[PDB]
Structure formats: C-alpha cells, structure tokens
Ligand binder design. Structure first.
Ligand SMILES: Nc1ncnc2c1ncn2[C@H]1C[C@H](O)[C@@H](COP(=O)(O)O)O1
Ligand SMILES: Nc1ncnc2c1ncn2[C@H]1C[C@H](O)[C@@H](COP(=O)(O)O)O1
Ligand SMILES: Nc1ncnc2c1ncn2[C@H]1C[C@H](O)[C@@H](COP(=O)(O)O)O1
Lengths: 520, 520, 520
C-alpha cells in the first residue's frame, strides 16, 4: 500500500482475453467480512448435538475468513465457457495473480433499535496467504462462499474452521490446534492493498473430448482375425444329445464379442440404480441403507460421487446412480428439495471407456469344472486396477470445482479429484482475512482478565483474481459436423444465464466440457 | 488521480475560443448520480403493461448511468451559436477531450423522517468508456439527461438500459445480455479524476448554407435552347376540331417548365399535411391512423421525422408535415401539451433542391396510348433514389442532436441521421458510471444468500467536455446583404435566452444553421 | 510440364489449414472430359422448340469445357464450415491457386457392341484461363458441374456455351461470335501439367453475424425523449363528440412506435406469400401469373431470388416468399419435385434490418386533408433506396455460390450477387479445356472438304484448387451463450453429411453463416 485515504488503491478488472493457445480470465468482486466468534477460537464437536457414530467430529472454529474461487464460473462467463468447450480438446491452468484493494472498514453501533454505521479510518484487517501449506486445507471440499457467478453480485466471506482426529466426540492426543495469529500477516488500512502471484505446477490437460470409438469396437470390421477362440464345448446339436467336442473359430465381423482385444474397461466400484420416475423405484428407504459407502475407522462414509463411471446405459436416460453424480441446485432452492429443483449432471461420454456406474464390471468363473461338475461363475461388482485398463476422469462443469489438494502421503493411485478438476500437490494457497480487534474503553484500574468487549465492526472491499489458462487445439479430420453447446433459439419467457425481472441471476443447467470428439 | 482529500482534482473550464478556421468550445457542469435499481439488473419488457403489438419490447435495465452531451447547446452559447451560423458555410467536429474531477460521495440515512447526509470518504465510483463499441449504443436516440443548456444548472445522470430482439414480450434466443461489470473500469475516490481523449473520423462538413437558386431555374433566362421538346399533339385548334399533328418548340425564356434539365429533385417519402389553424384540419383522429409509417417485422413504426423534405410550400406558412418536423418544448412544458407550447422547426431552405414533404414527387404515365385509348398517368407519392438526384440533409438546430452511430451493416445509402447531424461509424464512446456497492453489516454467521442490503448513497461532482470544431469560411461574392440571425431589438418583458425572475433558464425559439446563401 | 509418361505430374492435395486469422483450404478432384459436338460450334436458338416470348434465346455451343468451383462445399468440409461460422464474424477470399495434373487421354472404339478403351499417349488437351475477361462469363449463374461436395466423387466437366443479343429467335447485328481457338492455349500431353495463381480484389467481409437489436428498438427504454410528436388531432373524447385539437406527447417507454428514429429499413421489392401447408394456399395457379417479375425489353423475367428480405414474419414459420428464397434439392431428387424433396433456405436473421419479403414496406399518405376531406393513405409495395436506409445482404450457404462477376457498366448500386456471395469486378478467370482433334485416316487423294471424321476419345485427370480465406474474429462481450450449429446427437438410422449403405453422399440440410450475434 502506498497513498492515503482519498486515493483508490486499485482499478476494477473483470475481462477475458483470448489469444492464441492461452486464455487470460480476470474477475473482480465486492466482498464483505463480518466479525466471527467475537474474536475467539472455539472448539467445536459433535458432542453438542448427538448425531450418530458416523457423523462425529472434533475441531476448532476461528475468527478468520477465507477467499474461495474454486469454481469455474467464477473465472468464466457462460459465453467464455462456450468458446472453451466448443473449440478445444483440453485446458489447464498456468499462472495466478490475486489482489485485494479499496479496503473499507465500518464501525456499527446499536442504540434502541437504531443501527448507525460509520467509517473507522484507523482500524486494520489482516491478510496472509499460506505458502507453506502449514494449515489445514479446507479448499476443494466444495463448500459455498465462493465468488458469485455474476460479477455484479456481492458476497460474504465464509468462516475458517477445521477438523482433526477424534475418538467419539473427544480429542485423541494427536489432535492439533492451529493458532492463525501465529503466522506473519500483512495489516492493511484503507490506503493499503494486498497482492501476490502464483504459478501452478505442471498437470495433465483436462480432457474436453468425448471418444468417437469404444474399447470393444476398436477392431477392423471388414477383416477376420488370425487368432482362434473357443467357440463351443459340444458338437453342434442335431436335436438328439449334446456330444463333447472342442471347436475353435476366428474372431471376425460376424462375432465381435468373442474377438481378442488388447484392452480392458476402467475400474468400477458399483452403486445402486435410481429412476427419476417415482413409480419405478422401490417403496422403501434405500438411500442410506442400500447406499454404496466405504468403512473407515468404524465410520461408514458414503461414497460420493465415487469413481468416474458412466451414469446410465445406452437407451436409458431416466436412471442415475444413487451417489454417482454431482448434483446442483436451481436458482432459489433451499437445502432440502425434491427432484425437480436439482440440476443433475450425467456422464454419458465415458460410456466407451468406462463401466456403467449402476451395473456390473463383468462375470468371472468361480469353480473348476469336471465331468460331473457344472461350470459356475460369479459377478464382479467391484474391480481394482488391472494391467491394460484405460478410463476417463469425471468431467468438470461450469459450476464444478477447479482443483483439489492431493494429500501428502506415501502413495496414491492416479490422483485426480473424484469430484473433478486438477489434482495438485501444491495448490493455490489459502488466503485468510480477519478484522483486527478494537477494544472498547478499558476500566481505568488494572485487571488481568480478558477483555471480551470490543467495538463491533466489519470491513468491505474488492478482490480480483486472474488465472492464465492454457489450451489444446482441435486437430480432428472428422468430416461431419461436431456436436456443440447451443443456446435455446426458440422464444421463451426469459433469457438463460441472465437476470430475471427481480434481479436474481440464475443458471438454468449445468454445462460439461465434453462435446468435441476424437478417436479412442 | 494523484493527491488526497483536501486538494481539488480539477479546475472549472467553460470557455469558447475562436481562432482562425477552428472553434474550441469547453463546457463544464455539476452532476449528481443516484443509486439505480438497488444495484441490480432487471429484465424489462412490455408484458407488464399490455400496450399494443407495435410497442412491445424486451430488454434489461442496469444500475449504471451514462453521460450525454449529444446536443449542440451543451457546447455552444447562443452567442457562440450566432457567430457560427452567421459567418460560415459549414462546420464539423475534429477532436474531443473529456474529464471527470472533484468527485464527492455522500451517504444518506433516514430516521423517523430526518434525512441526514454525510460524506463517505472511502467509497468509490466506477467509470469506463467503451472504446470498442461492444455495448448497445443508446446515444443518438435523442433522449433527455444531456448536459443542461445553461452552465449554472445541475443535472442528474440518466440510467443505462438497452433493448434487444424479442417475440411479443418474450425473448428470442438471439437476445443478448450484457453485464457491465464485465469490462475494465477505473475506480475513483474523492482524490481521483478521470480523463480520456478522442478524435472524430473524417466526415462531410455540415451545410450551413441555403441555396440561392433552384434546380428548375438553373438555366440562363436570356437565351433559347437548341433542344426541342414535344409541344402539342394536336394542330392549333381553330375552334372546329382537333387534328392530329406533332409540333416541337425550343426551350426558352417563355416556357421554362418544358425546358430540358440535367438534374432531378431529391427523393421523397410522403407524409400528411396538418394545419396550425384548427378549423382547417379535418375533424377526426388521423394522427396514428392517417400516419406515414413503415412496417417492420409485423410492427408498424411511425416514420419520424423522415427523409429531409421541405416542410411547406412557398406561400403557405401554417401547414406542416404530420411527422416531418423536429418539435421542441417551450420552457416548463409537460410531456403532454397543445400546439402553443411546442417549438416547431421548419425546413424552408431545402425547398430549392427537395420536394415538399406534404406533396407529391411528380406524375408519371401509367398506360400505352392508342387511337382509341386516352393517356393515363399516376401520382408518385414515394420515390427512391434515381441517377441525377441532388438533395440537402435536414438542418441541425441549437437544441438538436450532434451525431448518431451508423449501425454496422453490409450496406447503407447516404448515411446521415434523419434527425440531423453527423453520421459516424465510430462515434464518441459511451461513458458509463456507477456507485460501487457498500454492504450493510453482515449477519455474523455465514449465509450464502445475496445481500440485497446496502448503505444508501449517491455521488456528485463535475464533468467537462471540450470539442474542437472545424469551420468553412464564407467566400460568396453576393452584392446585397445576407439574412442573419438577429436578437429582438424592441423592448420586451424579459431577455431571450436568459433567466427570468424565478431563475428558470429558457430557450424561446429553435435556431437553425442555414442563413448564408450560395449558388446551387 | 517436365518429365515423361511414367512419372506422376502432381500429388493429391486435399487439406484444411486453420492458422490465426486465415484458413487455407485445398481440394482435389478427379475429372473426365468428353468430346462435345464432334468438335463443332453450333448456333443454338429457341427457334427449334417454340417456347414463348419470354424464353427466346440465341447463342452458340462450343466443344470446350470449363471448370467450376463456385460453391462453398467444394472448398469446405461440413466440419470446416462449422468452425468458420461458429467462431467468426466474417470471411473473405484472398488468393487462389489452381492446378491440373496427372492427365490421361483414352481412345475408345466400338465394334459390334464391344467397347474397347485404350490409352492414346501422343494426343493432347488444350487449357487456357481467360485473364482478360474477353469471353462471355457463364460462371456465377449457379449451374451444375461444379466440383462435387465429396472428395471421393468423380465429376464430368460441363460444356461451354454462351448467349448473346437477339430479336425473337433471330440474331440482331450486334450479336457476337467468339471462337475459342482464337486464344493462346497451352497444350498438354500425359507428362504435362497446368498451373496458375490468382489474387482476389479487395471486397467487404461477408457478414456471418445476426444482429441482436432491431432498427425500431435501438432506443433507450428507460428514458423519455425531448422530441414531441403529434399524438392526436382531436380532443380526448368524453363520449359526446370529437373536437378539433392538436396534442403533442414525448416519445418514451410507453409508446416506442411513435418515437423519433434516425434510420429506415432496407429497400424492398415485394413478392407473393406461399404456405407450406397445402390447404392454406389458394386453389389456382398463381406461380407464374401472380409472380413478381421484371419487364425487360418485352420479356417478363421472374425476379429470383430478389432483393434480400426477411422470408417470414416473427411467429409464422410455414410461409415463404414465392420467388424470394434459394431452394436446394435433397439427395437423389429429379428436376421436377414436390415440396418434401426440396431444401428450402430462409433468412430470419435479417428481420431486424430488412422488410419481410411477403409484406409491405410501409404506408404513405396519398392526399391533402381539409375540413371536408378525410385523410387517405396508400400502401408501399416497392421502395427504392432512401437516405438513411440500412440493410443486410442475403446469406451465403454451404451449397451456395461464392462469387459473381459485376457486369461492366456505367453504374451500379451496392453491387452484391442477389443469390449471395462476393461481387467481383475481376472474378477468378474462366478455365477452359478441350480435347484436341485427332483425324481418322484421310482418303489418300486430296479433297478440300471438312473432315467431320475423327477418332472418338476422352481425357481424364485430377484438378486441385486452393483458396486462402481471411477471417474476422468474434469480439463480443455478450454474457449468455451464443446459438451454434449443432449435429443431431440423438440416435438415427444414418449419419448426416456422410455416405449411406449404397455409397451415395448426401447433404441433409442447408447451413447458413449467421449464428453469432452482434449489436446493431
Ligand atoms: N489429475 C491428475 N493429476 C496429476 N497426475 C495425474 C492426474 N491424472 C493422472 N495423473 C498421473 C497418472 C498418469 O500416469 C500420469 C499421466 O501424465 P501425463 O502428463 O498425461 O503424461 O499422470
Ligand atoms: N452524413 C454523412 N456521413 C457520412 N458519409 C456521408 C454523409 N452524407 C453523405 N455521405 C457520403 C455519401 C457521399 O457519396 C459522400 C460525400 O463525401 P464528401 O466528403 O462530401 O466527398 O459521403
Ligand atoms: N458485395 C459487395 N461487393 C463490392 N462492393 C460492395 C458490396 N456491397 C457493398 N459494396 C460497396 C457499397 C458500400 O458503399 C461499400 C462498403 O465497403 P466497405 O469495404 O465495407 O467500406 O462497398
């Protein structure tokens, strides 16, 4: 920060720049930060509300807030998102630049119902980014409080709190307490501003393409293989009795399923099938009971969304996996809603390489046949990785999360966030912010005790974030036209992705990245 | 912006400088910007008020305001306007320079009827000019909110909203939504100021001259042409019977109308004739029913003012075209007034080259004559452009619009604004302004919802605009004195173009540019 | 040409290169040229088949063939055409490069039903491009014989013949005879190849954008004009009697139609309205009788397609102008078909700036009102260009013609081909080709007479054409998604723009260039 009160500390930048193979998206918002917990750290636990053995937790809640811009629609307008997914086979972030400026602090007083708000010029806020990843990382959990979709909106900064190890509702001795005033933090008055730059580590391009071939069909339809398979264990029946024979054919156009193949579909961890038409579902509650969930340290944790898998089969639109999809709300929807209010995403583009989430991986033989014994087989509901598997990660959506932090561990297998996006070992740091305490008048004779009495105040201002995205051009030689993302065209009562008569911005549908096709 | 609170960011400049062939006019005003729509974008449509099939509309309304200086009297004092039109055959703009400064922001509170206004030092405003013409262009539509005629007046900035395509009151899928926080915009506190410069593209000089000749009379009166015309299809009657003969004369002083001519009058699109003396008009409502209007996409849109055409005939002062004139209000006139309160402009100076707006273009033969058949002709009410036409664009008035933006299209014919002034493919950019939201105290526990609750505030300050005009000197050799624009001379209850006893500035009459004459 | 028989004279190039602001499209085909008219020039005329006064013609037919690549789908794959129109606001050609190579000549013999074809090594073909525009120009008339849509197709070169002035079926003395062996032409054996380069003259970008605003709605909806209009010619009726009064309002949000406007819709030349649902059409033949046609030199020539005008009104999909559209055939359609077999193009994107082709331009007052006389008005069916008109040229389609040659004349008004594309004063030259005559054995004693007896032969080979196209990028700030051209998505019996089970390439629908929007 340089100049004084009457000089703005930074300009509004919200813009998109499409140049060559890069796209530089800048977005600026206006934020407001309350005073959390009356400047106190409080240990929160599930002991207060009984809950259940699976939902128990122990942790801390802090006065600090934090900035979240982990969703795409923060950085992209629906138009810009349309250019991205129509013209390109992939994109990944490169650089990041972050600014706070035009900081204002207000003090508020309450007298007999009157609420008076006045500028407090000399009070400060505290901002620090954690570069060393020393704090618990609560980003990537898909919480709210991210910058709004719509530039003209104003948002409130969420509170920062974290969870640690526990036994029941108590605290095991490995539990950690992190005091956030124990880090260096820059203090900013109304003239000061805050800025830093960041550079993403190298990650694979996201795949914005949907394959035009399937694993089983990669063959050549016109030509007949030179590899035999075992066609029949009996002689061709003449209508009398089956007679033992071994007969081998060649894989060919007639029979593709029997034909030899180099590759296997991706792994699957299966989940229940739910239909959108109510009368086709069973009458019972199978939501939690018939759920697909993993058992960790005595806790049954629902598997959501789970391993990336095709949501439904070919001809079945209405079915969806119980836990296997990302689900979004329509504008103005509460936290408890019915089916019509949610926006449900499906992955139909991974059908070629991936199993259907609601169905088996395959079928495998469970016993040794003999003359007297008959061949038996069992179904494979779950399958780990086998040599020769290929798969496709879950798509990212305009509302979906951009990145998540790969935990620090001895090992991991093909880390990518199951919700979607870019797994990062060193993600964009957490930016934390707090209103510095201002004490109310002290008693005039010394007492050691804690104040607990402060001037109520809040601070507002603008925040801007600029990410440099890298692109991968579409090389395809396909003759016929691609699928594209297309606006409505026919007349309707109001425009999609635009404010209504009341000024409420609304997103009608989710938008995935996979339209353009390429060979498998 | 440079210095702090207690230092004025710019001087008052309102001045006129007449040097050589240029005139540099500077004008400065004090403006006030409210808070529109509580910082919201609202889709507006004709669905709310039923209206009629022609008046349906669909669009958006924005919190942003915009500066309009599209009228001449913004830049010209009546004296300066008098020098311009008396001494010159034409003028066109060259350069433009724009400044905002001395910006003040006020916060206002309402308690039990008391209205308290106090400075808010740290709050900002947002200003950006659209250089790339990316927004809808609402200038040139002759709306209100332009800088006042009179330097000592204070004005309020109009709200920015725009219209798009529609079907009925609904929105066709080609409708566009433009978020104006999606552009880079400079943010200004009380110490900051805003400035940019502009340069007009090359355009034809406006014609401030009224021709001293007419198309039909361009000939030499003393000499007799060598070209024959067909004088009579009968023998000169001796009082008995007409006898077929063909007879040719020479065009000469006796008969000028029959004489051969190189040029044709300008095009016309005809309109109804209305008289200012009530008893001469028909008793009926022909205003909308007998109107001259064009039919576009099922909508009947009145043609106003229409193609430039002489308002009345030679000896008829009282008649005026129904839609064919620009009409101004007298001081202190409501939006619904009678004839005496309007200031009605007439073009009598284009009578030489242009058709009369209330009368036919000509008469043309509709059939092939024969021995038995008699020659028939039909009237030409509308005429498109024909090779050999000359015409004069509508004059500009001290109250009239300076420029309009030529739409971006494949083709256009002789673009000039039908209201008047300079057609520009890249007009002066739109300068937009908004008061940055200041949030009221947030709830202290996190909620995702939109604030909707802000501190009510407005901002005021000064704006100055300086246009460099180029002139074309009067070369004429005419012996006798010109017509000029002359002040009243005889005593009257109050001065014209000056404040009355109540401080109300008033413009008594419109003033056109065409006085000086030149040969056709 | 350089090397000999056993060395190929050129490689196959069919490719598309998208780089920056340019797109370089190369296409190569295999052609076959018969022997026309037994090497004779024959005067053709309508005297042979009586026809009618409008269809009479006189001209010549030549042995020469000519290469036509005047349609877009020659140079563009449907995919490439999709990139073009989705990503860009305009495109125009820059350079042209043309090659003949791998020329083969075959001689054919017919004995008792056996058809024997053998190479003729020493025979030649003749090729010359007309750079000086000395020949009649038959390109741009939208004939057949253009390179096929589909690279793997083989096509036959059309015959070159031309028409001249005539009186009835006879020849006026101004008729011209052009012998095409009177030009320099390169002669090519199987080793030789032919090449030349060309550079387009500078032309306006085609407009691939559809306006998001309309002329009538360009105003600002929130603000009220300072210009009065004439609202009513009577006093507001109290239910007793109309009383003469003149009353003026301000143009404002309530009444947009009465509001003053700077611009006028494009010109129109009207045409009859036809409905696609048979029962709504009149029962009669109005095709030719009720047609819109122009009368030239006693000939009534249908106006097709005519001036660019919106095909139908807002809510009416089914109606189309009688002559006012370009009509394409579906695959495998004869030259006489019903409605279902044609592919009918509509311009709905010029509705904002252009009149509807089936409806009036406007309405205009035909008489001078008085106390006794009532105001009368007449409809404007045709309108020439008036100052202040803007319009949009007809769109170009993937099947449509690319260019046409602006005739050489004293004057023209806004030349653009009414069918579509780029008007050129010096278009790509006509490339002509012929098989040089090979005489059959002469009689062995001298006779002066014409041979008339030759060896029957034909020649085949490849032709490649490479055009360099320039692009105009899409700058728009529009928030919500654009309309795009999108493939079918849902399952269907066969792929669009691809061969069927029989190998027949087919184009399911026409594809226009106008999807992306911009402000008017
Ligand atoms: N989302 C994500 N983040 C980080 N690492 C990943 C991810 N997905 C896969 N991988 C690992 C596993 C692959 O062996 C390798 C491909 O990197 P390539 O760059 O394609 O050669 O990268
Ligand atoms: N108002 C306006 N704006 C822009 N272009 C116009 C206008 N009026 C006419 N023209 C065009 C049409 C004329 O052919 C030409 C005269 O330009 P000159 O400079 O006089 O040679 O300019
Ligand atoms: N199709 C076509 N070919 C050639 N000339 C045309 C065509 N359409 C319009 N014009 C002329 C008429 C306009 O005055 C001018 C615009 O050129 P601009 O380049 O846009 O300044 O070009």
């Amino acid at each position: 920060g340089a100049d004084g009160v009457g000089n703005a500390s930074g300009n509004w930048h919200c813009d998109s720049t499409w140049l060559g193979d890069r796209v530089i998206t800048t977005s600026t918002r206006t934020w407001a930060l309350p005073t959390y917990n009356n400047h106190l750290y409080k240990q929160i636990s599930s002991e207060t509300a009984g809950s259940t053995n699976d939902n128990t937790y122990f942790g801390y809640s802090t006065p600090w807030g934090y900035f979240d811009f982990n969703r795409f629609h923060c950085h992209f307008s629906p138009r810009d998102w349309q250019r991205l997914i129509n013209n390109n086979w992939g994109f990944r972030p490169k650089k990041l630049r972050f600014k706070l400026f035009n900081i204002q602090v207000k003090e508020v007083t309450t007298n007999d119902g009157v609420t008076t708000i006045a500028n407090n010029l000399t009070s400060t806020i505290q901002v620090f980014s954690d570069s060393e990843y020393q704090l618990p990382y609560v980003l990537g959990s898909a919480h709210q409080g991210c910058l709004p979709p719509f530039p003209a909106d104003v948002f409130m900064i969420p509170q920062y709190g974290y969870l640690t190890l526990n036994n029941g509702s108590q605290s095991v001795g490995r539990s950690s307490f992190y005091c956030l005033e124990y880090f260096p933090s820059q203090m900013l008055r109304t003239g000061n501003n805050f800025e830093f730059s960041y550079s993403f580590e190298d990650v694979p391009f996201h795949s914005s393409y949907a394959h035009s071939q399937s694993l089983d069909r990669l063959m050549n339809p016109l030509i007949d293989q030179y590899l035999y398979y075992l066609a029949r264990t009996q002689s061709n029946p003449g209508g009398t009795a089956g007679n033992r024979e071994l007969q081998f054919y060649q894989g060919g156009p007639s029979t593709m399923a029997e034909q030899a193949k180099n590759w296997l579909p991706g792994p699957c961890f299966r989940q229940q099938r739910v239909s959108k038409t109510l009368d086709q579902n069973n009458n019972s509650n199978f939501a939690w009971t018939g759920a697909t969930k993993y058992h960790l340290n005595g806790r049954n944790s629902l598997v959501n969304p789970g391993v990336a898998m095709a949501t439904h089969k070919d001809d079945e639109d209405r079915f969806f996996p119980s836990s296997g999809v990302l689900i979004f709300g329509k504008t103005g929807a509460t936290n408890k809603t019915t089916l019509e209010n949610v926006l449900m995403t499906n992955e139909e583009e991974i059908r070629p390489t991936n199993p259907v989430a609601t169905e088996e991986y395959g079928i495998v033989s469970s016993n040794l046949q003999a003359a007297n014994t008959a061949a038996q087989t069992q179904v494979v509901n779950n399958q780990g990785a086998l040599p020769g598997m290929v798969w496709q990660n879950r798509d990212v959506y305009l509302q979906g999360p951009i990145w998540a932090k790969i935990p620090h561990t001895d090992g991991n297998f093909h880390p990518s966030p199951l919700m979607g996006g870019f797994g990062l070992k060193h993600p964009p740091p957490q930016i934390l912010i707090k209103n510095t305490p201002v004490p109310a008048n002290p008693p005039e004779v010394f007492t050691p005790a804690k104040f607990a009495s402060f001037i109520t105040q809040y601070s507002t201002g603008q925040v801007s974030v600029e990410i440099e995205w890298e692109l991968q051009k579409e090389n395809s030689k396909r003759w016929n036209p691609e699928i594209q993302y297309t606006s409505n065209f026919e007349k309707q009562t109001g425009v999609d992705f635009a404010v209504d008569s009341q000024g409420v911005y609304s997103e009608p549908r989710p938008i995935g990245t996979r339209y353009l096709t390429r060979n498998l």
